[model samples]
Target: STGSATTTPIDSLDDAYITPVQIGTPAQTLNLDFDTGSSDLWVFSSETTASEVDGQTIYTPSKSTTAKLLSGATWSISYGDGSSSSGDVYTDTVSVGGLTVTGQAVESAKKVSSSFTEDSTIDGLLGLAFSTLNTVSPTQQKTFFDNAKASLDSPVFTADLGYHAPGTYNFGFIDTTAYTGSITYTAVSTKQGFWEWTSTGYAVGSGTFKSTSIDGIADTGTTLLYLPATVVSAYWAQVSGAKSSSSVGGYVFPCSATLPSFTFGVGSARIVIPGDYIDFGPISTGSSSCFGGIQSSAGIGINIFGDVALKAAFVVFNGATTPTLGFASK
Candidate 1:
């Protein structure tokens, strides 16, 4: 039987994500961030334009017997971080944890912007967004998980993201021990090319659930939780020394301030975000001040449940149906 396998995602510097992915015949390995926000499996390759490829580990496709160039196939992608990559495509064996999918479209980057070029450890990215968002030319390609789902025991994957620590990405099976309590589910609408859903309402400390029904996206790729400006202001108001700083560009609280808890609604379950989690580590020297994890979602016009919020709960990305998101305390 083809069973599910679990892989631990490493905690990266600058609070980004990193997971291992094996590609090609002999299994050339790379550290990729599994981003649910976009769809493209691209890596830094030896064919990369030398000037653009700084210190990242490059994949040499010619050496892999299973790496076959798809004559006219090519790809290019960009991120909200203002980073971008463009390249040719190849069909090869791709594996995450122990699950392997053959003939998966692997985009080999030939060019990258400074945002990617300077990230020393990240060799590339493995997009977890739906296959429809794949950037392949002529034909869109399926994601590795999508290709493997047909043979999986259960067509699902779980993301157990952690706070400033390593966590697991369980493919094709749910680990009963990874989460506490029952999973609370919410339906997702993919019409906007995202895992889009409504947060319904939120709470500050033990306050009442506001019943706001705000729009949001559960994005593994993003680093912070962003919500409507008014909602963000309301949450910060509960903090004693929390003040919006022009220098900091958002709210920043004094290190000694006692922060309040935050909660978001999902069905009958409300995942509470600890006050310290809102601290988001330190900003100035000797932890004198801290950067806020929950900030305004003003510019983008959509709330984003980024790593900060994700780490506090167990996430079930149900791919088979209306594509529901089940959340529970980790």
Candidate 2:
């Protein structure tokens, strides 16, 4: 009725977080990104084009006695990050942590974007977003969480993303010991198929709170926190030698610069992100300039509370009939 999985950052940059999943009869294990921004448990498989296969692991359905083709079903998806993957579908015995689900849709990629192939740390993605966002045609598939929630003791999941450390994803129940302080619950808007919520406001370092509503999604798939240009500019202004570079993309500052902490409000609760959390990584291997983890969402249609912000607190995705989100200090 409950399960838990350990996920770790694929690299020092925390470009992606990966969790191992067991699929099929004998259970071929593959490391996948547990993405809450999208729906569809797609993977690099035997069906994938050889040229696009790189160093990632592949899921060969033929080797799994329990694998069955979902006849005539197909799926394709493009991410906001510009990566894409598409292929035929299969139903297999899938398991994560200690929980198992039979007849779970497993999309096998026939084609993938260059970015996916180059990122060998991940073989594919395990979408945790609402099933409404599933890409399978004619018959959309439910996400792993959706299919397993009914059987769970509590229809909820929790994310405890760490800074440069392994994190946890707990299904069916919350781990009270994982966090400190009481949780602040907020209404969630699932109409758009995302775990979208409105933030009360934000503050730069020790500055006063800005009383504005910022609607955004809590997306673990995304690597950075993206907010309105006004808020982003305010945060960067406090740092010397910081600049918005067209060439390097986003805001970059001297790696050694003393940065201010960032804080955002969830109702009356304020979650503070350490300045080092915003340092992200260097622009180049040995470059003095480092890219900021918080950037302007000028062109991005929706604001995102990505890993950078999520890591500051423990987040609960309550999947009750009328879903709500709970945030707690950790």
Candidate 3:
């Protein structure tokens, strides 16, 4: 069976990525953020107050013949960064790249937080995380990936995200050609509804890799890297003028300075993120000052292997029990 689709970044801010999707009988299209950190297929819609929406494209369920209201059902979500949404529910035919799945829950936003509305270009989020994290009430909902997995040849998917350019996500199969070598495997915990795993060690650039045994999640939704304060300081120590600046909200440094590679363990493969990627982008445009994407996930317990790190490797989100994660060089 044909069971894969390609995802690309939108032309707006390079903060996140979005992919096209079809909903309902005749199909109303929306490009959604394929967020592995969340588990809801929500969109800006007719249910939303016009004032609540900005430049986003709204999904009108009334126009879709296949849309059916799930009476009394509703959903609400608050993300790590404090952005939130609350909405009603509808069951409809949802398809991605021609792979159709009927009766998928489509959350229509009645209200969205200011922070959410402020983020431009994204209309909604398609959560690829475990269904356990789904927020639908009266009855839980499964994600598009979960619903389509059973019909797939293998209950697996792969995320091939790129830096500012373009990338792809493959379902039901892993295209061997996308990666350069054998995948290093690690077991993950779904207890937190994330692709959580432990890295036995890490280091800067070609420095001797340390066996620090860091525990973290592979979050595609996040834009940067996040680790312990100690880990962040160690890497910052390698870069001159790097300091925690309150005015900037995180570590601030001169953008021109060369950065050491930030590497982490995934079995035997030490996935290294180049210094260039760590610079994230300038904190203030036209200024030599910059903010690092690799900030502290301190007190959060779990470090986040965000887009900055993920883009450096080809990742496998294995769905089989004791769910395994595989990483390889692109």
Candidate 4:
């Protein structure tokens, strides 16, 4: 369903990240980095050894006055980044906002990766992308959409990614009052975990590159969007006097010029990636350079649109309604 445009205070447990609603009763409040790149909900558990749960948030079922643990199942997840986690599975009454869903699937990891174990700020990740990418059994397991679908006064989900302040990312019914026009939705292409798409072309300022055709995926899990060499070279060439340099990671340009705004149109929806996201830190080597949205992936898959692009738009994955995705303004 669609969400209301009325903005509410999405409280952050820590100043840097948005706080997530507690799932399951007795409740376990997890710090989930709501991701549109994949569909799965995983949390670090207290059952994990100190070494495994080091920096992650551990949910102690015993601590929850109302928590009930499912005794028969185990779960394991491996990410594309080579990070993996495993634990037992359980069901409990889950709640988000004012909505509570009973018998929701939850994973209590006994073992977690060093990267995840070391991240104290983010405890887990909640995948809101699509059910097709879900690793759980009963492939049709209802995620956030499954529980809140019918209750959402409208049939859409809008994510208003915060730029400076506590970036606002929310779920629930779509609020039509926020937008002046209709919400645009692109058809879902059956691909890997990433949301794949084709770009007609790229444009910066008033100049458009008609000769450049690009295809890639939009992924919220990744930190930076990756583009092909051809598109990357052409786009960077347009930057005034930017010189390409090789850093420890990859080829990055360094220049002190004002980069023009670039836009990518998929079908009729056009999204602009601000230059600051490309420049990253103001004083870094890639500072003032148009950060390459395009990265080199030898035999991986398609080009990817990482958090840089996702933060620009409101994306919703409608797993409750015939496996669809809805995109609207925040």
Point to the candidate with the largest lDDT: 2
lDDT per residue for candidate 4 within 1-330, as digits (tens), equals: 232222222232111233465865456776676666666667777787677665555677777655666565666678667887777766666555555666776667777888777677667766666556766643334466555667666544556555443445445655455444556666555466455556666776567645445666656566665666665666667766654455535445554655555666655666676665454432354455434443454345567766655565666544444444555544
How well does candidate 2 match the true structure in TM-score terms? 0.99
lDDT of each: 0.83, 0.94, 0.85, 0.58
Residues 1-330 of candidate 3 have per-residue lDDT tens digits of 335556776643347888888888788888888998889999989888788888888889889998999999999999888789999999999888767888999999999999668866788999999999999998999998889877877888889987777788888888999999789989899998998889888797777887878889899998888999988888888888999997878888887888888888888787878777787667777888888878999766779988888988999999886699999987
Runs in model 3 lying further than 4 Å from the true structure: 11-13
Q: How good is model 4 by TM-score? A: 0.79
The list of candidate 1 runs beyond 4 A from truth reads 1-14, 284-287
As for lDDT, the candidate ahead, 1 or 3, is 3
What C-alpha lDDT, on a 0 to 100 scale, does residue 50 get in candidate 4?
77
lDDT of 1 by residue, 204-226 (tens): 99889898787888888888889
Cα RMSD (Å) between model 2 and the true structure?
A: 0.7
Which residue pairs of candidate 1 clash?
Answer: 200-213
Clashes of each: 1, 0, 0, 24
TM-score of each: 0.93, 0.99, 0.96, 0.79
Q: What is the C-alpha RMSD of each candidate to the true structure, in Å?
A: 2.1, 0.7, 1.4, 4.4
Winner of 1 and 2 under lDDT:
2
The runs of at least 3 residues in candidate 2 whose Cα sits more than 4 Å from the true structure, single-residue gaps closed, are none
Ranking by lDDT: 2, 3, 1, 4
